Amino acid sequence: IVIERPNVKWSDVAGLEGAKEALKEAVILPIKFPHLFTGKRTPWRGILLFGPPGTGKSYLAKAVATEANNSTFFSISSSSEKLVKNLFQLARENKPSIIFIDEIDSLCGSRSENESEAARRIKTEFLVQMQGVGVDNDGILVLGATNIPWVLDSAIRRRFEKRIYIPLPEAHARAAMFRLHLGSTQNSLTEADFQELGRKTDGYSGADISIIVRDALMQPVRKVQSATHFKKVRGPSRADPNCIVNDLLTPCSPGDPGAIEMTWMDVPGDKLLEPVVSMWDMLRSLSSTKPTVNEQDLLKLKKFTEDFGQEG
Numbered sequence: 001i002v003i004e005r006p007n008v009k010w011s012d013v014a015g016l017e018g019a020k021e022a023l024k025e026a027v028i029l030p031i032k033f034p035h036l037f038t039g040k041r042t043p044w045r046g047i048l049l050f051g052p053p054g055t056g057k058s059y060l061a062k063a064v065a066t067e068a069n070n071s072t073f074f075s076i077s078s079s080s081e082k083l084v085k086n087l088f089q090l091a092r093e094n095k096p097s098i099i100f101i102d103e104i105d106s107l108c109g110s111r112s113e114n115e116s117e118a119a120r121r122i123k124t125e126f127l128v129q130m131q132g133v134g135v136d137n138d139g140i141l142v143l144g145a146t147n148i149p150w151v152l153d154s155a156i157r158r159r160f161e162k163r164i165y166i167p168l169p170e171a172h173a174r175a176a177m178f179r180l181h182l183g184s185t186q187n188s189l190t191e192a193d194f195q196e197l198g199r200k201t202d203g204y205s206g207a208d209i210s211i212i213v214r215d216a217l218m219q220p221v222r223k224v225q226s227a228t229h230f231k232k233v234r235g236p237s238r239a240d241p242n243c244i245v246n247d248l249l250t251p252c253s254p255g256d257p258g259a260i261e262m263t264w265m266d267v268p269g270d271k272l273l274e275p276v277v278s279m280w281d282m283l284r285s286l287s288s289t290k291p292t293v294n295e296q297d298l299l300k301l302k303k304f305t306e307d308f309g310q311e312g
């Protein structure tokens, strides 16, 4: 449904050097330098991003969605469904355009034979759109995401000539994801800290880490809400940062010199000085969270890789 353009720069996507290049070569260059991809170099029709969950598929998708030079981006997902015909339409009308279908593994059921009457109808609607009588020769590419690609139907799988794997982040990659998600928020983690976190999250996916930071990140909020005492520290003016004040209030332990008796209720709106997210927090946040992506994922996944190679 969403017909937007996001703001996820390659920089934000950590790791995935090759995915990045592979996607530049098949999506961005053909757009910028059309004369280069004519004749025998017509870019592939559909790319299929696949691999363990939370490794970057959807995310990376938005990356190309931003790096698409005004080349309108269309995104749909698992959700009278002739609206498929309708999607490709506005797409051809606005070429060059991209189509991203998250978790394409939706329309299928190649395990326990999950079968529906008209879902067999929904598939073929699009399964036909791939060629089109009125050739969509246009600069239109179809992106497909999936964490369970083997359950895919050869019918669709084989309309994606170029397929890309999206792996579990390596060390350096993790570290950056910690710094990235932390964003520009007040904290106190040193480089050596990120690297140490990177080393600790061995085997975690990118979504796992994001789930971690989003938690630790909320640590200074809890401390402020659940506090019982507040010191009276000195720090930047809430209304004008470059003007220190010796007036701000910050939550602190009852057993601390300068500890006033009162909760956030009393703390004025513009005198609150929040704590900085710390390494002790991220670690506590890391502990109560364990990697989900087990070897089966890569196991039944390694299969698809070998037994299907390209041409799907």
Ligand SMILES: Nc1ncnc2c1ncn2[C@@H]1O[C@H](COP(=O)(O)OP(=O)(O)O)[C@@H](O)[C@H]1O
Binding pocket: 012, 013, 014, 015, 016, 052, 053, 054, 055, 056, 057, 058, 059, 060, 147, 169, 177, 205, 206, 207, 208, 210
């Ligand atoms: N390689 C990555 N770089 C930065 N963030 C990532 C990466 N992979 C996953 N994430 C995080 O997880 C989310 C995207 O998950 P995707 O949508 O990548 O999961 P799927 O890959 O869809 O399971 C984003 O919100 C992002 O914060």
